Each structure stands twice: as C-alpha cells, then as structure tokens.
Coordinates of C-alpha atoms and ligand atoms in Angstrom, one line a residue:
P1 CA 23.4 10.0 84.9
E2 CA 23.3 10.3 81.7
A3 CA 26.2 11.8 78.6
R4 CA 25.1 12.5 75.6
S5 CA 27.2 13.4 72.6
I6 CA 25.8 16.3 70.5
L7 CA 29.2 16.6 68.7
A8 CA 32.0 14.2 68.5
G9 CA 35.1 15.1 69.0
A10 CA 38.4 15.0 71.5
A11 CA 38.9 17.8 74.0
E12 CA 40.8 17.9 77.4
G13 CA 41.7 21.1 80.0
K14 CA 40.3 22.5 83.3
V15 CA 36.3 23.2 83.6
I16 CA 35.6 26.7 83.2
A17 CA 32.3 26.6 85.3
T18 CA 28.9 29.2 85.6
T19 CA 25.5 28.5 86.1
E20 CA 24.3 31.5 84.3
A21 CA 23.6 31.3 80.4
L22 CA 26.2 33.1 77.8
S23 CA 26.3 35.2 74.7
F24 CA 29.2 34.3 72.8
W25 CA 28.3 37.0 70.2
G26 CA 28.4 40.4 73.1
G27 CA 29.9 38.4 75.3
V28 CA 33.0 36.8 74.1
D29 CA 36.1 39.0 72.4
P30 CA 36.5 36.9 69.0
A31 CA 40.5 38.5 69.7
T32 CA 40.5 37.5 72.8
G33 CA 39.1 34.4 74.0
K34 CA 37.6 36.6 76.9
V35 CA 34.3 37.5 78.4
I36 CA 33.0 40.5 78.1
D37 CA 29.7 40.9 78.7
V38 CA 30.4 42.8 81.9
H39 CA 27.2 41.3 84.0
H40 CA 27.8 37.4 83.6
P41 CA 30.3 36.1 86.1
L42 CA 33.2 35.0 84.1
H43 CA 33.4 38.9 82.8
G44 CA 37.2 38.7 82.9
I45 CA 38.1 35.2 82.1
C46 CA 40.0 33.2 78.8
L47 CA 37.7 30.4 77.5
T48 CA 40.8 29.3 75.9
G49 CA 41.2 25.8 76.1
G50 CA 38.8 25.3 78.8
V51 CA 36.5 22.8 78.7
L52 CA 32.8 25.2 79.2
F53 CA 30.2 24.0 81.6
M54 CA 27.1 26.4 81.1
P55 CA 23.5 25.5 81.4
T56 CA 23.1 26.7 77.8
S57 CA 23.2 29.5 75.7
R58 CA 21.7 32.6 75.7
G59 CA 21.2 35.8 73.6
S60 CA 22.5 36.3 69.8
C61 CA 22.2 34.2 66.9
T62 CA 25.9 35.5 66.4
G63 CA 27.1 33.5 69.0
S64 CA 27.7 31.0 66.0
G65 CA 29.8 33.0 64.0
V66 CA 32.1 34.2 66.9
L67 CA 32.6 30.1 68.3
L68 CA 33.4 29.7 64.2
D69 CA 36.2 32.6 64.6
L70 CA 37.4 30.9 68.1
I71 CA 37.4 27.5 66.8
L72 CA 39.6 28.8 63.9
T73 CA 42.0 31.1 66.0
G74 CA 42.5 28.3 68.5
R75 CA 41.0 31.2 71.0
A76 CA 37.8 28.7 71.7
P77 CA 37.7 26.5 74.5
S78 CA 39.0 22.5 74.2
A79 CA 34.8 21.3 74.5
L80 CA 31.3 22.9 75.3
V81 CA 28.9 21.0 77.7
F82 CA 25.1 21.9 79.0
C83 CA 22.4 20.2 80.8
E84 CA 19.2 22.1 78.1
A85 CA 18.7 22.2 74.6
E86 CA 21.0 24.1 72.5
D87 CA 21.1 25.4 69.2
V88 CA 23.7 28.8 68.7
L89 CA 27.0 27.4 70.1
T90 CA 26.1 23.6 68.7
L91 CA 25.5 25.3 65.3
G92 CA 29.5 27.0 65.4
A93 CA 30.5 23.9 65.9
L94 CA 28.7 22.1 63.2
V95 CA 29.4 24.5 61.2
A96 CA 33.0 24.1 62.0
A97 CA 33.2 20.3 61.5
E98 CA 31.5 20.6 58.5
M99 CA 32.8 22.8 56.8
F100 CA 36.2 24.5 58.2
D101 CA 37.7 20.6 59.2
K102 CA 37.9 21.2 62.6
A103 CA 35.6 19.5 65.6
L104 CA 34.8 21.0 69.1
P105 CA 33.1 18.2 71.2
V106 CA 29.6 19.4 72.8
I107 CA 27.9 17.0 75.0
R108 CA 24.5 17.3 77.2
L109 CA 24.3 16.2 80.2
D110 CA 21.9 15.5 82.8
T111 CA 21.4 19.0 85.8
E112 CA 23.1 16.7 88.2
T113 CA 26.2 15.6 86.5
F114 CA 26.6 18.9 85.5
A115 CA 25.9 20.7 88.5
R116 CA 28.8 17.8 89.8
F117 CA 31.4 18.3 87.4
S118 CA 31.1 21.8 87.2
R119 CA 32.8 21.7 90.4
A120 CA 35.8 18.9 88.7
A121 CA 39.5 20.5 88.3
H122 CA 39.9 18.9 84.9
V123 CA 37.7 17.1 82.2
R124 CA 39.0 15.0 79.5
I125 CA 36.2 14.2 76.6
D126 CA 36.9 11.1 74.2
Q127 CA 34.2 9.7 71.4
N128 CA 33.1 7.1 74.8
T129 CA 33.2 9.0 77.5
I130 CA 33.4 12.3 79.6
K131 CA 35.5 12.1 82.6
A132 CA 35.6 14.7 85.5
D133 CA 39.0 14.4 87.7
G134 CA 39.4 10.9 86.4
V135 CA 35.4 9.7 87.6
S136 CA 34.2 8.6 83.9
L137 CA 30.9 8.7 82.3
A138 CA 30.1 6.7 79.2
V139 CA 28.5 9.0 76.4
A140 CA 26.2 8.2 74.0
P141 CA 26.4 8.4 70.8
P142 CA 24.8 11.4 68.9
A143 CA 21.4 10.8 68.5
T144 CA 20.2 9.2 64.9
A145 CA 18.0 11.0 62.6
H146 CA 14.2 9.4 62.8
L147 CA 12.9 12.1 60.0
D148 CA 10.3 12.2 58.1
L149 CA 11.7 13.6 53.9
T150 CA 10.3 14.6 51.0
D151 CA 11.7 13.3 47.4
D152 CA 13.1 17.0 47.5
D153 CA 14.0 16.8 50.4
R154 CA 16.1 13.6 49.5
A155 CA 17.0 14.8 46.0
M156 CA 19.0 18.4 48.0
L157 CA 20.2 15.9 50.4
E158 CA 21.9 13.3 47.5
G159 CA 23.2 16.1 46.3
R160 CA 21.0 16.1 42.9
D161 CA 20.8 20.1 43.4
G162 CA 24.6 21.3 43.8
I163 CA 27.3 20.6 46.8
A164 CA 26.3 24.1 47.9
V165 CA 22.7 22.9 48.5
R166 CA 23.9 19.1 50.0
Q167 CA 25.9 21.2 52.2
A168 CA 22.9 23.3 54.1
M169 CA 20.4 20.1 54.2
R170 CA 23.2 18.2 55.8
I171 CA 23.5 21.2 58.5
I172 CA 19.6 21.1 58.9
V173 CA 19.2 17.3 59.6
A174 CA 22.1 17.2 61.5
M175 CA 20.4 20.1 63.8
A176 CA 17.3 18.2 63.3
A177 CA 18.4 15.5 64.8
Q178 CA 20.4 17.0 68.0
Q179 CA 17.0 18.6 68.4
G180 CA 15.0 15.5 68.4
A181 CA 13.0 16.0 65.5
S182 CA 10.6 13.4 63.5
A183 CA 10.1 16.0 60.1
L184 CA 11.2 19.3 58.5
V185 CA 8.7 22.2 58.1
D186 CA 8.4 24.6 54.7
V187 CA 9.9 28.4 55.3
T188 CA 7.7 30.8 52.9
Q189 CA 10.9 33.1 53.9
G190 CA 13.8 33.9 55.4
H191 CA 15.7 36.6 57.5
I192 CA 19.7 36.4 57.7
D193 CA 21.8 37.7 60.7
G194 CA 25.1 36.7 59.6
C195 CA 26.2 39.7 57.6
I196 CA 27.6 42.0 60.8
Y197 CA 30.8 41.7 60.7
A198 CA 31.4 40.6 63.6
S199 CA 34.2 38.2 63.4
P200 CA 36.1 37.4 60.1
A201 CA 34.7 34.4 60.1
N202 CA 31.5 35.2 59.4
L203 CA 33.0 36.7 56.2
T204 CA 34.9 33.2 55.7
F205 CA 31.5 31.3 55.7
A206 CA 30.0 33.5 53.4
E207 CA 32.5 33.5 50.6
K208 CA 32.9 29.8 51.8
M209 CA 28.9 29.0 50.5
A210 CA 28.5 31.7 47.4
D211 CA 31.7 30.1 46.5
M212 CA 29.5 27.0 46.8
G213 CA 27.2 28.6 44.6
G214 CA 24.9 28.7 47.7
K215 CA 21.3 30.9 46.7
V216 CA 18.3 32.2 48.8
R217 CA 15.3 29.3 47.1
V218 CA 12.7 31.9 49.7
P219 CA 12.8 35.5 50.0
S220 CA 15.2 36.1 52.2
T221 CA 16.2 39.6 54.0
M222 CA 19.0 40.9 55.9
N223 CA 19.7 41.9 59.2
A224 CA 22.2 44.8 60.3
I225 CA 25.6 45.2 58.9
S226 CA 28.6 46.3 59.9
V227 CA 28.8 49.1 58.0
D228 CA 26.7 52.4 56.3
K229 CA 26.5 50.8 53.3
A230 CA 26.7 54.1 50.8
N231 CA 28.5 56.4 53.3
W232 CA 31.3 54.2 55.1
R233 CA 34.3 55.2 52.7
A234 CA 32.9 59.8 53.2
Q235 CA 32.3 58.0 57.4
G236 CA 36.1 57.6 57.7
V237 CA 35.7 53.8 58.7
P238 CA 38.8 51.9 57.9
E239 CA 39.1 50.2 55.2
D240 CA 40.9 47.4 56.6
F241 CA 37.5 46.9 58.8
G242 CA 34.8 48.2 56.1
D243 CA 36.2 46.8 53.1
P244 CA 35.5 42.9 55.0
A245 CA 32.3 44.5 56.4
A246 CA 30.7 44.9 52.7
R247 CA 32.0 42.4 51.1
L248 CA 30.4 40.5 53.8
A249 CA 27.1 42.4 52.9
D250 CA 27.7 42.2 49.5
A251 CA 28.0 37.7 49.5
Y252 CA 24.5 37.3 51.0
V253 CA 23.2 39.6 48.6
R254 CA 24.7 38.0 45.6
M255 CA 23.1 35.2 47.2
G256 CA 19.6 36.8 46.4
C257 CA 19.1 38.1 50.1
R258 CA 17.1 41.4 49.8
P259 CA 19.6 44.1 51.1
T260 CA 17.0 45.4 53.6
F261 CA 20.0 45.4 55.9
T262 CA 17.8 46.0 59.2
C263 CA 17.5 44.0 62.9
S264 CA 13.3 45.0 62.5
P265 CA 12.8 42.7 59.6
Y266 CA 8.8 42.7 61.6
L267 CA 8.4 46.6 60.6
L268 CA 9.0 45.7 56.7
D269 CA 6.0 45.2 54.4
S270 CA 7.2 41.6 53.5
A271 CA 6.6 41.0 57.2
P272 CA 5.0 37.6 57.8
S273 CA 1.2 37.3 59.3
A274 CA -0.2 35.2 62.0
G275 CA 0.6 31.6 61.6
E276 CA 3.3 32.0 58.7
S277 CA 6.0 29.3 59.3
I278 CA 9.2 31.6 58.8
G279 CA 13.1 31.1 59.2
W280 CA 14.3 33.7 61.1
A281 CA 17.4 34.9 62.3
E282 CA 18.1 37.6 64.9
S283 CA 16.8 37.5 68.0
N284 CA 14.4 40.2 68.6
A285 CA 13.6 39.5 65.0
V286 CA 12.8 36.0 66.0
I287 CA 10.5 36.6 69.0
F288 CA 9.0 39.5 67.9
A289 CA 7.6 37.7 65.3
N290 CA 6.2 34.5 67.2
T291 CA 5.5 36.6 70.4
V292 CA 3.7 39.5 68.4
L293 CA 3.2 38.6 65.5
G294 CA 2.0 34.7 66.3
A295 CA 4.1 34.1 62.8
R296 CA 6.3 31.1 63.6
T297 CA 10.5 30.6 63.4
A298 CA 12.9 28.8 66.2
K299 CA 15.5 30.9 67.0
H300 CA 17.8 29.9 64.5
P301 CA 21.8 30.8 64.5
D302 CA 24.1 32.4 62.1
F303 CA 24.5 30.1 59.2
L304 CA 21.4 28.0 60.1
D305 CA 19.7 31.0 58.6
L306 CA 21.3 30.6 55.4
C307 CA 21.2 26.9 54.7
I308 CA 17.3 27.4 55.7
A309 CA 16.9 30.0 53.2
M310 CA 18.4 27.9 50.7
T311 CA 16.8 25.2 51.2
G312 CA 13.1 26.6 52.3
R313 CA 13.5 24.0 55.3
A314 CA 13.7 24.2 58.9
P315 CA 13.6 21.3 61.7
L316 CA 9.7 20.8 62.4
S317 CA 11.0 21.6 66.2
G318 CA 10.1 24.0 69.2
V319 CA 8.0 26.8 68.4
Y320 CA 6.9 25.5 65.0
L321 CA 5.1 22.9 67.2
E322 CA 2.1 24.3 68.3
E323 CA 2.3 22.0 71.9
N324 CA 5.6 23.9 72.6
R325 CA 4.5 27.5 72.0
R326 CA 2.3 26.7 75.3
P327 CA 3.6 28.9 78.6
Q328 CA 6.1 27.5 80.4
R329 CA 6.5 29.4 82.8
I330 CA 4.0 32.3 84.8
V331 CA 6.1 35.9 85.9
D332 CA 3.3 37.9 87.7
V333 CA 5.3 41.1 87.2
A334 CA 4.6 44.4 89.6
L335 CA 2.7 47.3 87.7
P336 CA 3.2 50.4 89.3
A337 CA 1.7 54.0 88.7
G338 CA 3.1 56.0 86.3
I339 CA 5.3 54.0 84.3
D340 CA 6.7 55.3 81.1
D341 CA 8.3 53.9 78.1
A342 CA 11.5 52.4 80.3
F343 CA 9.3 50.2 82.2
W344 CA 8.7 47.9 78.8
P345 CA 12.7 46.9 78.1
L346 CA 13.1 46.8 81.4
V347 CA 10.5 44.1 82.2
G348 CA 11.7 41.9 79.3
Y349 CA 15.2 41.8 80.6
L350 CA 14.1 40.6 84.2
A351 CA 11.8 38.3 82.8
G352 CA 14.7 36.6 80.8
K353 CA 16.8 36.3 83.7
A354 CA 14.0 34.6 85.4
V355 CA 12.7 33.0 82.8
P356 CA 16.0 31.8 80.7
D357 CA 15.2 29.0 79.3
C358 CA 11.8 28.5 78.8
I359 CA 8.7 30.7 77.6
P360 CA 7.5 32.8 79.9
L361 CA 3.5 34.4 80.4
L362 CA 3.8 37.4 81.9
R363 CA 0.8 38.8 83.8
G364 CA -0.4 42.2 85.8
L365 CA 0.5 44.5 82.6
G366 CA -2.7 43.9 80.1
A367 CA -4.2 47.2 81.7
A368 CA -1.2 49.1 81.1
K369 CA -2.0 49.1 77.3
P370 CA 1.6 48.2 75.5
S371 CA 2.8 50.0 72.3
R372 CA 4.0 47.6 69.3
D373 CA 7.4 49.3 70.0
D374 CA 6.9 49.1 73.6
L375 CA 6.5 45.3 72.8
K376 CA 9.1 45.7 70.5
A377 CA 11.9 46.6 73.1
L378 CA 10.7 44.3 75.4
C379 CA 11.3 41.2 73.5
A380 CA 14.8 43.0 72.3
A381 CA 15.7 43.1 75.7
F382 CA 14.0 39.7 76.5
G383 CA 16.3 38.1 74.0
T384 CA 19.7 39.3 76.0
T385 CA 18.8 37.2 79.2
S386 CA 17.4 34.0 77.6
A387 CA 17.3 31.4 74.9
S388 CA 13.9 31.1 74.3
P389 CA 12.7 31.9 71.1
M390 CA 8.8 33.7 72.3
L391 CA 7.2 34.9 75.1
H392 CA 3.4 35.9 76.3
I393 CA 2.4 39.2 77.9
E394 CA -1.2 38.6 78.9
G395 CA -4.0 40.9 77.7
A396 CA -1.0 42.2 74.7
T397 CA 0.1 39.4 72.4
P398 CA -2.3 36.9 71.1
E399 CA -1.7 34.0 71.6
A400 CA -1.5 34.8 75.6
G401 CA -4.1 33.0 76.0
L402 CA -3.1 29.4 75.4
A403 CA -3.3 26.6 78.3
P404 CA 0.1 27.0 80.2
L405 CA 1.4 23.9 80.6
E406 CA -0.7 22.1 83.8
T407 CA 2.9 22.2 85.4
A408 CA 3.8 25.5 84.9
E409 CA 5.4 27.5 87.8
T410 CA 4.9 30.6 88.9
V411 CA 8.0 33.9 90.1
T412 CA 7.4 37.3 90.2
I413 CA 9.4 40.4 89.1
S414 CA 8.9 42.7 92.0
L415 CA 9.3 46.2 92.2
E416 CA 12.6 45.4 94.2
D417 CA 13.4 42.9 91.6
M418 CA 13.3 46.4 89.6
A419 CA 14.9 48.2 91.3
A420 CA 17.9 45.9 91.4
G421 CA 18.0 46.4 87.1
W422 CA 17.5 49.4 86.6
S423 CA 20.9 50.0 89.1
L424 CA 22.2 47.2 86.9
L425 CA 22.1 49.0 83.9
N426 CA 23.2 52.1 85.5
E427 CA 26.9 51.8 85.8
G428 CA 28.3 54.7 85.0
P429 CA 28.5 58.5 85.6
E430 CA 26.2 61.6 85.0
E431 CA 27.5 63.2 82.5
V432 CA 27.4 62.0 78.8
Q433 CA 28.3 61.9 75.2
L434 CA 26.5 60.0 73.5
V435 CA 22.6 59.5 73.0
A436 CA 22.1 56.0 71.7
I437 CA 18.9 55.0 70.5
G438 CA 17.4 52.6 67.8
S439 CA 18.5 48.7 68.6
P440 CA 17.2 47.5 67.8
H441 CA 16.3 49.4 64.3
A442 CA 13.3 52.2 65.1
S443 CA 10.4 52.7 63.9
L444 CA 9.0 55.6 62.1
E445 CA 7.3 55.7 65.5
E446 CA 10.0 55.9 67.7
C447 CA 11.6 58.5 65.4
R448 CA 8.4 60.4 66.1
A449 CA 8.1 59.9 69.8
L450 CA 12.0 61.4 70.3
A451 CA 11.1 64.2 68.0
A452 CA 8.2 65.1 69.8
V453 CA 10.0 65.0 73.0
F454 CA 12.5 67.5 71.4
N455 CA 10.1 69.5 70.9
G456 CA 12.4 71.8 68.8
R457 CA 14.7 72.3 70.6
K458 CA 18.6 71.2 70.0
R459 CA 21.0 69.2 71.6
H460 CA 24.6 70.3 73.2
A461 CA 26.9 70.4 71.3
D462 CA 29.2 68.2 73.1
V463 CA 26.5 65.2 73.2
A464 CA 25.5 63.5 70.4
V465 CA 22.5 62.2 69.6
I466 CA 22.8 58.7 67.3
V467 CA 19.7 56.7 65.8
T468 CA 19.7 53.7 64.0
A469 CA 17.3 52.4 61.9
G470 CA 15.9 50.7 58.6
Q471 CA 16.1 52.3 55.0
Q472 CA 12.9 52.5 54.7
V473 CA 12.1 53.7 57.8
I474 CA 14.4 56.5 56.9
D475 CA 13.0 57.1 54.1
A476 CA 9.5 57.5 55.1
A477 CA 10.1 60.1 58.0
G478 CA 12.3 61.6 55.3
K479 CA 8.7 61.9 53.7
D480 CA 6.8 63.3 56.8
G481 CA 9.4 65.4 57.8
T482 CA 10.4 63.6 60.8
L483 CA 14.0 63.0 59.6
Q484 CA 14.2 66.9 58.9
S485 CA 12.7 67.9 62.6
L486 CA 15.2 65.2 64.4
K487 CA 18.4 66.8 62.2
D488 CA 17.0 70.4 63.1
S489 CA 17.7 69.5 66.5
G490 CA 21.5 67.8 65.7
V491 CA 20.4 64.2 65.7
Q492 CA 21.8 61.8 63.4
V493 CA 20.1 59.0 62.0
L494 CA 22.3 56.8 60.4
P495 CA 20.9 52.9 58.1
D496 CA 22.0 49.4 58.1
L497 CA 23.8 50.2 61.0
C498 CA 22.8 49.3 65.1
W499 CA 24.6 49.5 68.0
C500 CA 25.6 46.0 67.9
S501 CA 27.2 46.4 64.8
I502 CA 29.0 50.3 65.1
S503 CA 31.8 50.9 65.0
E504 CA 34.2 53.9 65.5
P505 CA 34.6 56.7 64.0
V506 CA 31.1 56.4 63.8
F507 CA 30.8 56.1 67.5
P508 CA 32.5 59.0 68.1
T509 CA 35.8 58.3 69.4
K510 CA 35.2 60.8 72.3
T511 CA 32.8 59.7 73.9
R512 CA 32.9 57.8 77.7
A513 CA 29.7 57.2 78.1
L514 CA 26.3 57.0 76.5
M515 CA 22.9 56.5 77.7
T516 CA 20.4 54.6 75.8
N517 CA 16.8 53.7 76.2
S518 CA 17.8 50.2 74.7
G519 CA 17.6 47.3 77.3
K520 CA 19.7 45.2 75.0
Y521 CA 22.2 47.7 73.9
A522 CA 22.2 48.5 78.0
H523 CA 23.5 45.1 78.1
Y524 CA 25.7 44.2 75.8
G525 CA 26.6 48.0 75.2
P526 CA 29.9 47.9 78.2
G527 CA 31.3 45.3 76.7
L528 CA 31.0 46.6 73.1
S529 CA 32.3 49.8 73.2
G530 CA 33.8 49.9 76.5
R531 CA 32.0 52.7 77.3
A532 CA 30.3 53.3 80.4
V533 CA 26.3 53.2 80.0
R534 CA 23.7 54.4 81.7
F535 CA 19.6 53.5 80.8
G536 CA 17.1 55.9 81.0
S537 CA 13.6 56.4 79.3
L538 CA 12.8 58.4 76.3
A539 CA 12.9 61.7 77.6
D540 CA 16.0 60.3 80.1
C541 CA 17.3 60.2 76.8
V542 CA 16.1 63.3 75.6
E543 CA 16.9 65.2 79.0
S544 CA 20.8 63.8 78.8
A545 CA 20.8 65.2 75.0
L546 CA 20.0 69.1 75.4
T547 CA 22.2 69.1 79.1
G548 CA 25.0 66.8 78.4
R549 CA 23.6 64.5 81.7
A550 CA 22.3 62.0 82.6
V551 CA 20.2 62.5 86.6
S552 CA 21.4 58.9 88.5
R553 CA 18.0 58.1 89.9
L554 CA 15.6 55.2 89.7
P555 CA 12.1 56.0 87.5
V556 CA 9.3 57.7 88.9
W557 CA 7.5 54.2 89.0
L558 CA 10.1 52.7 91.2
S559 CA 10.6 55.9 93.5
Ligands
FES1 S1 21.7 44.3 65.1 FE1 21.3 43.9 66.9 S2 19.8 44.4 67.5 FE2 20.5 45.6 65.8
MG2 MG1 20.5 39.2 72.6

C-alpha cells in the first residue's frame, strides 16, 4: 500500500467514489458543484465537501478553472484522490494554493488501496496521513523537484524577470515535480484555452496574471471564447455575461495572445510542423497536434498554458518524450461496409471509453481512408472520454508505425459497442429545433461538405442551423462562395463561439432538442444546454434541418 501527497492540505468528508474519470468542465456545474455529465455514473450528485475518488480526470483542459471556481466559492470537494497520473485538476488546486490562498489536498494511491478506500464512508487527510474509516495510511510528502534547469530558467524562477514570470515558473516546476520529470523543454508556440468564460475564476485568474505583468514570450493563439467578439452586444447577449466574457478574451489579448478565438488552431497558417515542440491546451487541439500533425505537446491544463507561454518552457514529460508516444494499448476496430462521416467521431468516443488513460493504436481502419476532417472529429470525441493527449490510427496517422510497448494489451471495438454508443448519444426525441455543427470549429472543407449536402435546399423555418468556426475559415468561406451558399439555405455561421461556449440567446431559447454531428458536443451537449441531444451524420443533420425531424434509427453501417 502506497499513498503519495501531490498537493498538501487538510480535509475530511464523506467518500464520493467512481471508477470512471470525470471532466470538471462540462461535467461539473460551478454554480452548484453537481455532476452534469449525463453519461457519468455520478450524474446529479453534489460533490461539495466530499472526498472524491476517481482513477484520474478525463476530457477538458478547462477543468482547472472550474475546480478553481469551486474552491473559491466553497462548492468544491474537500479533497481529490486518484490512482493514476493527473494534471488538470491537480493544476487547478495548485493555482489555488499558489495564487488564491486556498489549499485543496490531492493524493495518489495505488490501485488496490484506491479500490479499498473507495468503499469507505469517510476519509480524513492531513499532511502525513490519509485515513479511511479510521484506517490510517502514511502519505509520502510531495516529490522533490530533480529538474535540470538552464541559467535562464533559474533567472525566471529567482524573479529577475519579474514576479509574474516567477509565478509561472513556480507552477511549471511544481507540475514537473509531480510528474517526475527531470528537465524542461522549449516550446515554439502556445495555444491558450482558459479564455472560455467557464467560471468567474477564469476571468479572475486572467486579470490577476495580467495585472501581475504577465505577457507571452512565444507566439500564442487563443481557443474559442464565450462571446461573438464583434457582435455579442447586438445579438442580445446579457451584459452580465457578455461583459466578463469579453474582458476575459481582452485580458489574454493584452498579454500578447493572438485573437484567433478558435478551437481548431491546427487549421491556421501558424500550425506547427511534424516533430515541433509546442505548448497547447484545448483537448482536441492537443490530440490533433500529436496524432495527425506529429507535433509534440502534453495536454496542458488551462492556466498552465499561459505559464508555459510566458516562459517558453514546459515540463519534459509525457508525449514530449518519444518513448511515451509508443502505442500503449492495441484496439482492433470493426470496419463495417457503408460507413459515413459519423463513424469517425463515434469510434473516437468509444476508443476513449475503451482506453481512457493511455495511448491507443487503432487497427483495421486504414483502408477506409479517413479525411483530415474525419481525423479531426475522431480526435475531438476521443478527448471527451480519455485523458491521453494522443492516439494512433494504423494506415492514417504519421507515427502509427511506432513500435507498441512490448506488453501492450489488445481490446476491440465491436459492432455491438458501436450500436450501444450510438444509442447512448441519441437519447432525445425525433423533432429537433436546432442543428449544431462545428465542435471543434469547422474546417473550410467541412463547410463546403455541408453546403454540398444541402444542395441549395432551404432549412425548415422551425429548425435553426448553426455552424461555429474560426474567423479565418469564415473569411475563406466568404471568398470562395461557401458562406453565401450556406446563408442561402438559412444556415448561420458564427465566429469565436463554439458549442462548448455558446449561450442564450445565440443558442436559440426555443430549442428543446438538437441534433449534432459532433461526438464531443453529443456528449457534453445535454449537461451544457439542458436540451435533449441527438447525434448523427452530416446528412442526418441536413435532413433534420429540412424536415424538422431526425429519424431515430441505427445508421446503415450498424443495421
Ligand atoms: S471550444 Fe470545445 S471543441 Fe470548440
Ligand atoms: Mg474534452
């Protein structure tokens, strides 16, 4: 039995335990502390005050900001107990201790002690021990940093570059220490994700660092934000929400981040190349960068993305190291006849459920020749159910020939798994009032494909059709006529916002049920919006847009 202090602190409370990872953004409501992931075993449970046992986290990089907000409002669990490596929630609690004078203890157990303690009714944590129903286990103190540092690293840490840079380096070194890294690594560019207005604390952190003098040292793009930056006032977004959401975006721009406002930064001209070491947040962008581009970045939590951008340095750990990019589990995926575009997000979603805490190699799919957009949708869905920052697809992705670990296990995704996942993501009626496309932000080709399915037909008056995309794609779609073709059918194309960040009234208030082709939004949509969510192919979406009805049925390749 082994217990390891990750972040110090004292806590006591009832045990809240699960064997399935949870994403605090999208899966936990900062207003209540309740689990809102409708597909998680803990759905509906309030986490406030509990000692939360889960193997690790999954999903969104924004969990750090949601946990920070919960800590600040007193709605957070009293402690976190994992049994695997974890970064997102650990970083949120680390920022709480470093910058907000609040300690949330985080402990990692061995898997067997984890399972035993998860049966307990009550757990007490202090600096030296964890006790489950009185049964006490000694807790090893936080790991001591054994990092190789450059002279400029030490200069930043000593404060010779100011207090903001020192604070960033302090956080980077503490994260490297808990990961057991022995060095840092240069990054050529950053991508900031905490600009989504997921909680008041997201704004508080950004303005705190900006007022501290923080500024990025490497070129750094920005993920989606929670306002249509140029239009939210005219759209009728309430001032109480739009003003802090806009100020959150403004704070990162003031700190030198480029206002790309997109969750598909790999589509920008600034996209990194194969082998390039970058420092990115946003789970789908991280996974796409490693998986499809062959670039290298850990799945950095929100807030850590800014520290890495401020210093140009990240912990040399995880998939920055070649050994850690080798496939850790093999997945044979059934390839039925007659697949369409919906196959790829479904497979990514199921691949994450099958392999939630290590890097999988997906076999059996190379002959199907997935598009860049197919890989994009797959990676985004994989992020929702997994913690890993990358995956491999035999015959499709550039590093898929890396030798798997000699002890890799092999699992399957069967047709039966696919039918079950399809029905899980389709718990809603047939009548829909909204079609939601573009999580992550739509490519230009995805917009062209959508116009091709529409074939000049016009949406039903009672069905809104909304595509979220980055500004540069919308500009390009305006040039080549795709934007007008979509407008001709009644489709709205929105910049900056994504389905992760959209809000009423831009999200139409009349909506009761929506259909999406995003595996990611199919998962998060129910809890985020309170609406019933349907999941289908691009053409399933267009058919619903023209008729107002999404037929409830398994796809052709599953019947
Ligand atoms: S911001 Fe979440 S995928 Fe777009
Ligand atoms: Mg996710």
